[PDB]
Design a protein around this nucleic acid. Structure first.
Ligand SMILES: [Zn+2]
Lengths: 94, 59
RNA sequence: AGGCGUCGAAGCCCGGCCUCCGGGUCGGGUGGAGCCGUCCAUGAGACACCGCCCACUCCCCGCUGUGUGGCUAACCCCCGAAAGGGGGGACAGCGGUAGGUGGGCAGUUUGGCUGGGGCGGCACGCCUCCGAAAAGGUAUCGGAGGCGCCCUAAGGUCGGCUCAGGCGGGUCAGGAAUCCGCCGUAGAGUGCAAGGGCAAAAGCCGGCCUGACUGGACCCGUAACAGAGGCGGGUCCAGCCCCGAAAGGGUGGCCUAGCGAACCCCUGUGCCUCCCCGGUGGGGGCCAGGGAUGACAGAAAAGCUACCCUGGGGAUAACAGAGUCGUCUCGGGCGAGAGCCCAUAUCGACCCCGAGGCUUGCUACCUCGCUGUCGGCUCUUCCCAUCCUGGCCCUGCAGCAGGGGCCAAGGGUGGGGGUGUUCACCCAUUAAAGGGGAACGUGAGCUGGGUUUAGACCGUCGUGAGACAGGUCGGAUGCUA
RNA sequence: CACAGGUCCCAGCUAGCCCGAAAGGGUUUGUACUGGGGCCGACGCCUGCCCAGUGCCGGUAUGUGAAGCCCGGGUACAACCGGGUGAAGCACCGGUAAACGGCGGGGGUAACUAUAACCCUCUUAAGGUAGCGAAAUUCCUUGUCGGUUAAAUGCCGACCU
RNA sequence: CAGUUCGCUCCCGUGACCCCGGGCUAGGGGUGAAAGGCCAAUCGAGGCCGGAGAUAGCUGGUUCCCGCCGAAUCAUCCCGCAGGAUGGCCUCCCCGGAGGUAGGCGGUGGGGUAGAGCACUGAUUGGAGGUGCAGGGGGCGAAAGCCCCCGGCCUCCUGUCAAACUCCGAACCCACCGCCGCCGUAGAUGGGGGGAGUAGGGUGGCGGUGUAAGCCGUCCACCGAGAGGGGAACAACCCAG
RNA sequence: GGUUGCACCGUCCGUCUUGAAACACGGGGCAGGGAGUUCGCGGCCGUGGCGAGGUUAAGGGGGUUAAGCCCCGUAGCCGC
RNA sequence: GGGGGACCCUGAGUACCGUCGGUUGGAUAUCCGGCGGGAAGCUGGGAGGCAUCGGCUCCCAACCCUAAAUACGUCCCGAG
């Protein structure tokens, strides 16, 4: 599907309809300073079997779109509803 | 599983131990202090068959 | 835009030098006073001068490691009670840590439904039609199909128009290119299955837009009655907006499919919080969006057992019984015909109606705290749908014989070859050498050749353990009624 | 099953293989005519092709590759992030089948009848050579022919589908 | 006689031979001329004591009497299918205080089954008429095309169909209202709390499926959980609780 | 009351199971023994005390042959 | 027995840091052990639940001993 690069929509911070740029969330790796990762590293040490499930090749054919819309007037970003599943996502100047 | 013959041999049981009491004895040279810088003369007394050597021994 | 020049310059000669040998740098000396643009070219101008670099390389000092060669003094190996001698050597050995390899050794897993189980299939998550019995609900490995997407337009609104097919007439132009007229209830189209809905539209053609948005309430469905995490849908309040003159509509696709808990992690945003207090780095918490578990209400996960073991199950298969008779055996109705004429001496197509439980199958009703298998031997008994013996009828019955049928179950129906065989085939006789039931009669009567444990070989399949309704050799038969 | 015989593999000694937590130890009072590890199995004649796969061995220019170390950022110090160095092992290359295993498949002919391989087309690492064959291997099968019997799902000989 | 013995028959019997006393190898271990054989009547991991009264959704058992009421084997979820949880059905106690509806009559609405029918969608025998209609078969013509037969497509007549067809359409069922009847102040409808059992049903009528038996649902009548009187005995059939 | 006769009726007991006289399992006789116990937490009920308050725990004193009996004990817990 | 000092003393492979294994409710914040490092030391040092800086509060390790209140019953008295 083709999606506009800019859309005029409501801005929660400006409390009015402004121009928002469309951007996609980039999935960063796990942080080693988080409590969950600290617990995982602590329990992985020493003798014993693997303590967590190990899923292999588990993923949906197509995934939902995690989009953020950033207001061009205030510079803050927000979300618009739930994601939708399309295999092809093309941002166009339309 | 069970052990192999090679594995059982390493434990030194009488099934695998060499019977080193029916043999004529170890064949080693005289200590090197006698041989160094000096020449010794000996006489052959007897030639015998060592049970396990694959070679005759002499006194 | 001047800088160099006794703070010594062009033009002449050889020497070393790097070098795309382009052509530049430089010691000495004949040399004793000149050298470049600025001007134009160059995509970007000065070998005018003053600065920092960037591309390769070398060398002077210091730092760092990696490898190589040598040494003995740690350490080790040998000889010797010892003294000491010899060999190796900062390796090896030992201690700590890091990655790989690793069925040598372990703990485990290898799902479920299933007209037994296995293989197969998924009825294991959803949508439509029939089943389904005119409110609701209703199952089967019931029947017929679809889904795990796609669309910035195929989404919102406003204006205008009417489709498929057919007929008649037209330059190339024909069955089919484009155009005029008429009939035309949708026979078209609506993204995709099916059902339903849509004609001054929900279809086609255009204009303007992003309501496919933010903070919340209530209700229906999955899941009737009648409990529900998650999810889907409907009716609204407020904010900011879109289309329109206005009414009015807009919380995605005309309605019904296109999808997912806990924990953890990533992103957005603006608040709370971290042990006596304060600042900083970092962490934790609240709200929103996303990464998936298809066995789809969400374990991470391969097999053999014939050396097998345990708890059970007639909730469930093999032998046998029971129900049924598709199949099997045996009949019947009609008569196209074949028989020199003649349907019925004999055979009887295509169809149709039955009997038996003697073949096989189907169900899973009795029996898994045991009802001992096939075949053979011994012995007893029963049925008739009669093979011979007794008596008859028709004949395409001259006789001798044959073909078909009727009454009749007293008697008989035997001996041998290969094969474990029943059966079937064959041999010599015979009046004939009938088919079946009795827990496929009969192992507290026998035998043990086959089948169906534990040993072993061959062929095929499997990486392997191993397996084969494939062959092959051996392999136990209890008893005082 | 074992066996004498054949052949292959590892090892020059502080070796190779093996027991163990370690210390120490078995082979070993041993030294390649030896010690240890597979497979076949007297004797006679022989033992053909294939290294693409799975194993094992040698190399490893090059890529990846953990900790440690070094450099930059960050932290008034660390946690944390990016880069360089980077052994073994994999990737890659070569030997190896008396290592595990494998050794195929369609058309037409030479019609001096008919039917055979000389022959031409896909195809792999290669297409089963000498032998033996209805075999303890053959489903059809009680294959077909010959001998054995009066009679042969047996037995022997032969053919090869 | 014996928890592996006896008789006949058979095999080795100078060798890898048979037997005795002293020793060593101990359980994931020993030993094995390899059968998973042997290791004190025990071996695909010995025996003794301990963990230990281990665990099981699987089998068995569970002790006096009378009185009152009295089920279920049906839906959703679970590596769930011989087991559990939430509901449905039973029982006991309490609050609250005037309505409630299993049956019937009339009314206001809803439905598409049986039957029937061809008006859509798809099948279906023959005939007649129209249409050259892009079809085929012949004759026929240099070529522009004709003449018939057959075929296709429409209309009519004639003879037949539909679980996944409907221009029609019952019996019947459901929702609501008024009334009759019945229940209720000796307390119903409803609400709160305590305790369960039930997750194999069977026969019978109806529906899908199957040659049939049977399998799967549905109806709630009978057995299950039910005496007595009958069908000769009978779970289910009749009278009757 | 013991035994027996006649007429009619009556296929044992426990158990899983839709279905038991069962050719489904447990059943020679008799006597004794034999199976919902204890603690901790929680829900609920019957009754009793006090009541915007309720109650003590460990422990202490008095008395007693004695561990019985009498008084104290506000820490703590629940509620407001 | 009290005041002052400007001199001296007050525990080292230890405290602590990194990493690894075990253990713990101890969670970036328990304790023990191995390996590689490793101080100050009176003008000194440590703790205050992630790490560091400032304040404030408390304390002085790396040496030793210590009755009573406690745990048990091979034994005894007494009791149910
Ligand atoms: Zn804004």
């Amino acid at each position: 599907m083709k999606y506009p690069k800019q859309i005029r929509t409501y801005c929660p911070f400006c409390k009015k309809h402004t121009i928002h740029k469309v951007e996609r969330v980039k999935k960063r790796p796990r942080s080693e300073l988080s409590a969950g990762q600290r617990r995982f590293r602590r329990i992985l040490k020493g003798y014993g079997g693997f303590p967590r499930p190990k899923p292999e090749g588990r993923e949906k054919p197509v995934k939902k779109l995690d989009l953020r819309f950033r207001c061009t007037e205030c510079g803050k970003a927000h979300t618009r509803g739930r994601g939708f599943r399309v295999k092809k996502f093309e941002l166009v100047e339309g | 599983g069970k052990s192999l013959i090679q594995q059982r041999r390493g434990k030194g049981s009488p099934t695998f131990k060499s019977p080193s009491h029916r043999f004529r004895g170890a064949v080693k040279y005289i200590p090197l202090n006698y041989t160094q810088e000096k020449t010794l003369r000996g006489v052959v007394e007897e030639i015998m068959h060592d049970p396990g050597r694959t070679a005759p021994v002499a006194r």
